[PDB]
């Protein structure tokens, strides 16, 4: 399952005639595109590898 | 001049080569919608804005 979430503030005069506004005209734009399932877990680092990436000398 | 009393031969050399340099550059391209949070005494507008995007794993 994939989730696309959007939030922001829109000026009414930036909305086009077809009730559309580009995402670059939204003030506090919060855009999120995430997923779950084993596909999403396959894109997470292992805990040991994350620990090393954060605490290894090099 | 007998017995090589005045015969002589000398050589000498001196060399120096120094150099240096530096360079910096930066580019930025994009679009962001900000909000006015203050109007100054001459009418100039203080603007602040933030865009947060989450794609997959960050």
UniProtKB/Swiss-Prot annotation, chain B:
It is found in: Cell outer membrane; Bacterial flagellum basal body. It comes from the Bacteria. Assembles around the rod to form the L-ring and probably protects the motor/basal body from shearing forces during rotation. The basal body constitutes a major portion of the flagellar organelle and consists of four rings (L,P,S, and M) mounted on a central rod. Belongs to the FlgH family. This is Flagellar L-ring protein. The gene is flgH.
């Amino acid at each position: 399952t994939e989730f696309i979430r959007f939030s922001g503030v829109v000026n009414p005069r930036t909305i086009s005639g077809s009730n559309s506004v580009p995402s670059t005209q939204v003030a506090d734009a919060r855009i999120e595109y995430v997923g779950n399932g084993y596909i999403n877990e396959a894109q997470n680092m292992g805990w040991l590898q994350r620990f090393f990436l954060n605490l290894s000398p090099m | 001049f007998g017995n090589s009393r005045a015969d002589m031969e000398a050589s000498g050399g001196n060399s120096f080569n120094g150099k240096g340099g530096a360079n910096a550059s930066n580019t930025f391209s994009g679009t962001l919608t900000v909000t006015v949070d203050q109007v100054l005494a001459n009418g100039n507008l203080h603007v602040v804005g933030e865009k947060q995007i989450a794609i997959n794993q960050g």
